């Protein structure tokens, strides 16, 4: 994948940890709150929009680690269907082998 895409993805992944991982309280505790005054909820709703947009985890693409391919990713291995098989048949994956039943 185009090198810019890799830089962009790692930038997003880093930036997400600087905010929402900590300031998730702003949404989950307040903007979602029912037990608390609607003025505070409104202020929190408006405040959340001020965080840098790329800090939302919903914007991470989750690319293949070895080639950055977006499609065909497998979450168990971190690899695309291509690189996973290349490693598999070369025996680099510690328990994977062809199945039959």
């Amino acid at each position: 994948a185009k090198q810019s895409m890799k830089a962009r993805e790692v930038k997003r992944v880093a930036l997400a940890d600087k905010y929402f991982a900590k300031r998730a309280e702003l949404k989950a505790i307040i903007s979602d709150v029912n037990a608390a005054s609607d003025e505070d909820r409104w202020n929190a709703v408006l405040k959340l929009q001020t965080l840098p947009r790329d800090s939302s985890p919903s914007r991470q693409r989750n690319r293949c680690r070895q080639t950055g391919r977006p499609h065909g990713f497998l979450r168990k291995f971190g690899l695309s269907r291509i690189k996973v098989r290349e490693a598999a048949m070369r025996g680099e994956i510690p328990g994977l082998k062809k199945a039959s039943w």
Partner: protein, 206 residues
Amino acid sequence: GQKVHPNGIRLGIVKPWNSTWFANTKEFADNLDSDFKVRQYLTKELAKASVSRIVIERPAKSIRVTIHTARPGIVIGKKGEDVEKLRKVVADIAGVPAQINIAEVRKPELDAKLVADSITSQLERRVMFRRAMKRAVQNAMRLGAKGIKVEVSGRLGGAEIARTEWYREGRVPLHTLRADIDYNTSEAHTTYGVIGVKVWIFKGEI
């Protein structure tokens, strides 16, 4: 048509895995990534030390790497001064503390990886591919392989149209699962582009 990769089909039947560790899904991908990084580093580092194989094992929240090479003294370094550098940089890459072990490949002529790399190097030296192939086959047979075949593919001799050329001696039963077929592939980056070399070596059944 296509053929199954002859090593992968034999895993657990007669061929062991090159990685051996247990992990839960949480750390599985990170183990696989750091293993890939260390393998890539060691391959780039030892490119002239005839490293055949790298085995990675992750005991007791530690990594230890076994390197199989046909040229051990070069990898070890005088007084062992080189394995210190390798183990430190491996500990840096993996983060966990690292141990490195080295093992002799006694007869590199019976190793498909070292034969493939030899042919590749000779091709990049602009050797005639026919001679490289013939030399490889003859040496393997005289040293006691039960069989061998070799293949070279693409723009051979700078020809304008690609060819595949292959040569076979002895017995090479790829469909026999009991057969310990060693196999490997390498690529020569000539001025004309990539030439692909494949090697199969048969050492007997079971």
